[PDB]
Amino acid sequence: AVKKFKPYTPSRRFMTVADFSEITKTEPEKSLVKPLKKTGGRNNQGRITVRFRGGGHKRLYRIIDFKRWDKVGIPAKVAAIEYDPNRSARIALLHYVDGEKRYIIAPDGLQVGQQVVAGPDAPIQVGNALPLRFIPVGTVVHAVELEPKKGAKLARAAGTSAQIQGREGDYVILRLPSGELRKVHGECYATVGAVGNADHKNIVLGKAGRSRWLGRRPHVRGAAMNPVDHPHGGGEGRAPRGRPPASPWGWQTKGLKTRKRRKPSSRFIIA
Amino acid sequence: PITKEEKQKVIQEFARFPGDTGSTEVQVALLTLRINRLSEHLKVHKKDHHSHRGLLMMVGQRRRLLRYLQREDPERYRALIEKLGIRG
RNA sequence: GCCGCGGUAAUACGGAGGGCGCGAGCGUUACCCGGAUUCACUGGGCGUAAAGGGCGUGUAGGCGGCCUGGGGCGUCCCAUGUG
RNA sequence: GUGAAAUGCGCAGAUACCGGGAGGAACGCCGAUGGCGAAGGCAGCCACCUGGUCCACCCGUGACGCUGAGGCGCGAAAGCGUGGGGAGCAAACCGGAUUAGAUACCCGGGUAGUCCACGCCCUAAACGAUGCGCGCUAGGUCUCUGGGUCUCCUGGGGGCCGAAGCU
RNA sequence: CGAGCUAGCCCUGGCCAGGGUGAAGCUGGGGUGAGACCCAGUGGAGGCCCGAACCGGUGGGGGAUGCAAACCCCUCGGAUG
RNA sequence: CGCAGUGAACAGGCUCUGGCGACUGUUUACCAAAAACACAGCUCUCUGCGAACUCGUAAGAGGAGGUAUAGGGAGCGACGC
RNA sequence: UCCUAAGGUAGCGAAAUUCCUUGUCGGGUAAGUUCCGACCUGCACGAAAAGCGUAACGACCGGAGCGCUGUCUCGGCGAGG
């Protein structure tokens, strides 16, 4: 729904926040499965290797289930929709009949009290997970494995989906959130429906702190540095790159394709 | 829709003397029922402007009448309105 | 004054002869009413001449079928004061 | 492809034909001088919600009516905001033609836009260029839709010709 | 050999006198066919305002073998991010 | 009752009109605080996941326990037109 | 008519951009190489190294008033180190 604020301050004029209808009636996360402390840390063995990352609210990690084929045939009730700091989509805590609990990346439509289940048997309805073969060609579907038994890799950003496009032997044609068209193995599970919290794209951050709260440090333009510092760097008063735009590292950044030519991922992709 | 029964029950429930099918008091309670039922509908289908017209036509009728009713009789004017829930 | 007059034969300009009107006046300009039923009550209209509101819903207001009495504000008549 | 052309596409394998798939828009025939709607306007099929209307039965209320300054709502297309979609078509824009010139008319492309949602905008040859309600004043002709002890009679609607009258 | 200065990030702690302004939401009334909305009352939001601590370092004067290898004075910026 | 009542001390001078930058912020420690950088937001571009990209001879790790509404690079820098 | 790959649109314009320049007209003042409003022959603006505007913000740079003053006419006296 996206709350918009009255301008009792500049900046709070452009800022908009999420509705939280979404999740209601459950905030403190599930002490049990949920938490491992999450490790803030914006680089590897010494050196920063992602620029401009750091700061931002101390944050606990919710351990979700991206491999639902453990619990084939066991249904579970959807117990609550709760807030996840660690991703754009919201999550649903569901108690399996099994006793056992886990978090699924909460698909659109899903509502407290629903029962949900995974297997080749499963009804073709919201939140249920299934091999791609036993899912009807045309349905949209998210949290898709890419190789069988490897965990859900596709379609987990808030409001994403993929669509079953066709069959083809052990394999099955898939239109991805990008627009790419990719064969994925029939045994690769996927959960019917799309992702939801799909207003997520429309938050207007609103000011430059906040950007900080989410741990995004300020990003200094190329020209804006000096030549030691960057390709664009230099120039007496203000400058026009001076051919052709480039990362700090030098490699071209307007139009240059980067994916590896002879990748065996090829032959599976088609867009 | 509004069934035969739901209709009748309202009518026999607001009559002046069993058999009375017209009458100010009843005519009203007919619309009221239609209205709320309609009221309820437009609340979902906001974009249905055509059907909204009719509502405004009834709304008048109801008014039209109530003003007659009130003019002749303050007594069973309260009765109706209160035992029916209107005046906004 | 309005329509218009004068480009070599002008009853329209200028003079002249004659003629019409009014007369100690006669003309002009200004302004009011009139003609103007051209803000229309008396007394105009809106298909194409200028004029129907793009269409509904309804507030104030305007207007109101048949019949019987009560009042008599509008309405009519009489006298009288004033005018 | 045109008036004839040229731009353009095509031996890097087009056009023409076949099979398999993707996607969006608009619904042929029925279809009419037809119907519905206060207007704008509404057209493949299905289901649900919902408005107005017509006929018959003379059962009920008992003048509860008509109109409506202002207010309030709706209001084609174009256009605007946020986001989705984008096959076809297409302002702008570019190419080829024509021409004295051609910022056009014709041809090859082509971006918004056209579509969805949500919110604005409020105009129009928004035209019957004819405000609403009622009563009254020859008929003829064909048509849609209802009701009748259905060669016909009656009610509601859509056209044509015309008494009186008006112009 | 150095990050016991300085720059960034990570882990865990601590700090921000007191004033002012008064968003949303509630409640109530008014409103309508329902609404939208408008009214009080409550409420307590913000890289909100004044201003100590704290952080700073704008302008001027002083210092200039200095109190000082960047200091002193008046003035000034931020002060729940 | 005084010339005088925030009687001492702490304690804003105001107005009109241009240029630049939307904004609070950051900087040349020690001559520059700005019209510089940053910034919410706009566009282009790469990346289908053993992602692209970065550090590393490698193993490895960041990216991210994220997955196109997400991540890298680049430019403009609220908003209006 | 010659040349080009094509010849600057909107909007701005003596500007942080104008050399000639103190351009020229207007405003402001007793007097204005600055300022403000205009006019363009724009030496050498112009659309995302954005174009033209913009409420509010500013220890940012320009131009006027009013208040007040030892800044000054022009200096004098006094206190302390």
Proximity of residue A213 CB to strand F below 7 A = no
Contact (Cβ atoms closer than 8 angstroms) between residue A78 and residue A163 = no
Residue with the two structure tokens 């193995």: A185
The whole-number Å distance from B18's CA to D133's C1' is: 35
Cα dihedral A127, A128, A133, A136 sign: negative
At residue A189, the 3 state secondary structure works out as: strand
The whole-number Å distance from A216's CA to F27's C1' is: 20
For residues A220 and A251, what is the distance between their CA atoms, to the nearest angstrom?
Answer: 18
The whole-number Å distance from A38's CA to F18's C1' is: 55
Q: Which fold has domain B1-88?
A: Helix Hairpins (1.10.287)
- The structure was resolved experimentally with X-ray
Proximity of residue B84 CB to strand D below 7 A = no
| DSSP H helix total and E strand total for chain A | 0, 16
The whole-number Å distance from A210's CA to D6's C1' is: 61
Residue B80: Cβ-neighbour burial (10 angstroms; 0-12, 13-18, 19+): buried
Rg of chain B (C-alpha set)? 14
Please give the protein residue whose CA is closest to the C1' of the nucleotide F65: A63
For residues A143 and A155, what is the distance between their CA atoms, to the nearest angstrom?
Answer: 5
Nucleotides of D under 7 A from a protein CB: 21-23, 37-40, 49-52, 59-66, 73-75, 82-84, 118-119
Which string of b and e fits B5-14 if b means at least 16 CB within 10 Å?
eeeeebbeeb
Entry resolution (Å): 3.3
Proximity of residue B70 CB to strand C below 7 A = no
Spatial CA neighbour of A185 closest among A136, A139, A134, A132: A132
